[PDB]
Symmetry: C2
Amino acid sequence: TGLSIGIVGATGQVGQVMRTLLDERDFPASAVRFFASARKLAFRGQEIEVEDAETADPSGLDIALFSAGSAMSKVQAPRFAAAGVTVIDNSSAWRKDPDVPLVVSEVNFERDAHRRPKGIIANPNCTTMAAMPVLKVLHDEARLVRLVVSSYQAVSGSGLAGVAELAEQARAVIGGAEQLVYDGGALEFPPPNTYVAPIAFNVVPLAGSLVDDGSGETDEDQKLRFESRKILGIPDLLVSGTCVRVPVFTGHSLSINAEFAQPLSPERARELLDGATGVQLVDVPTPLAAAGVDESLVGRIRRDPGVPDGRGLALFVSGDNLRKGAALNTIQIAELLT
Amino acid sequence: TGLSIGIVGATGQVGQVMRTLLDERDFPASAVRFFASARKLAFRGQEIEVEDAETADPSGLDIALFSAGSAMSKVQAPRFAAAGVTVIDNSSAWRKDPDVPLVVSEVNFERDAHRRPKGIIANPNCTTMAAMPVLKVLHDEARLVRLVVSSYQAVSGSGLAGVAELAEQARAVIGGAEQLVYDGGALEFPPPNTYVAPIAFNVVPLAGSLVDDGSGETDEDQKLRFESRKILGIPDLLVSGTCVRVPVFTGHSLSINAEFAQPLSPERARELLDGATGVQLVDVPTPLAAAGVDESLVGRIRRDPGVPDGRGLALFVSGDNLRKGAALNTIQIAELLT
């Protein structure tokens, strides 16, 4: 193709996964550029200059994959787009923009991706992303009308800081761990910094900032609503989500109660999902099995008897939050663009 | 009172918590008996003989607290009851018996406990138990009609074997933990024994045996339905539960979407729960904070917009599965009996 691609925020975890994935698809080193801010990184038999995202000239680039935070994206994505670059942004900066498609590669690319008057395609929230290839298939069959979601979120979603917080707490208390059986305050945890409570040997039902709307929901709770709506193209979708942090390094999981407009049996759900792109049907999905692979793992599909006439399911999903949940999806979009 | 009390299965985790709690209420050592099977344990300034549960003579005992498994309970609870002993059983043996009250101390003692023609009171499932003092209060106000529940279950619910499985896996892999960020299969886990997958640095959406009824639900999934119904006295309650294991030592947590027959706002829910017996209202409930205390921690109360007219809530609960979830409730029942 002779396609030219850039990565903005190349040294972060997501940036690293983007690089690994570009490599694992045998993409020429000669057609790749890296950017960060405030000097060389190896990529397939070559050392690549880490340019300055703010001041470097983006022209020549066909596609830029951003994973550099929202503040940077608000400024730099239009600058890159102005220079003729198609920007795929892994941040929240453009997700709520009605002129920016919010795209899961095998879900709404054809429907939404071609309409990008700002030159920007937004990459969805990782937690939402993991459920999308699963729900799309069920929605196409039976029409999805309501979601209840409880998540089990890995710390790598918080960048390196989440990883370090988990590792350092676990290392500090592992020696006396069994005392936590009788007294959760028995041990000396290094004080939390990123999270509102210790994460090692704990669960923490609080992810994100509390939205200033009187709801009691965090921005992460609400992403499950807003982004599912936009991605699935169901503007009035009913959603109640609870984001909960767990002591897992990589791999987000979701306990999903999904209601449809017509009956949908577990057997039929299994039959549809077994075929599906970006999906693997398993008995017991786990984040450890999901970490390092590409598909969303789905299983534990049951009828929810709280929905009349077999229109409700309970199902469980695990997916890698750095791969499909971030890096992989941007690259899959880039492939579909070219 | 001069009350005489026995503990059957005194050396298990629950048995240990029963002993600690009897002590913490200044109960005389002279009025206590211990039982197990196949020799002395200290209790408040005295050494108590560990009798043989199968062959010892139960007469003299007013109350026996059983935590010795269901197989033992099926045989020994009637034998003890025949000898005039009121049996409070922390096992699943008598939970489904229509002549055995299934009692949460501050929920349905007055309603159900006095009717015990078999001399047996059953102690509820720990996971269900944690939600009961919370849901009772909300039910009394607005009438509970539907539950969706996703749990975050600690390993101590599985006895010492769960604790050891978690601790040994964590110790084995902690050294290379950060590699799990990119590859969930990077490290060498000691093979799981109790659980269907590794539990350290994982979540496992499978707790219990699959019920032989074509549902895909485990016995633990279904306990949330059957026991909530019996305890709250709502025979037709709609329930969908998903039991998920997490790397926590003690403290079960529940993400609950609860629907009522009339509108119930988060504000009103908070006001009712702030007063409530066996409940503590907190911003962010966690199993670490719950482990070693008596109350159910509840917070993150939000409207569930998937239920029309403000009749639906989302809320989060953490509770100690060995204390209120097992030992404490049996003792609270014993207090109310005397």
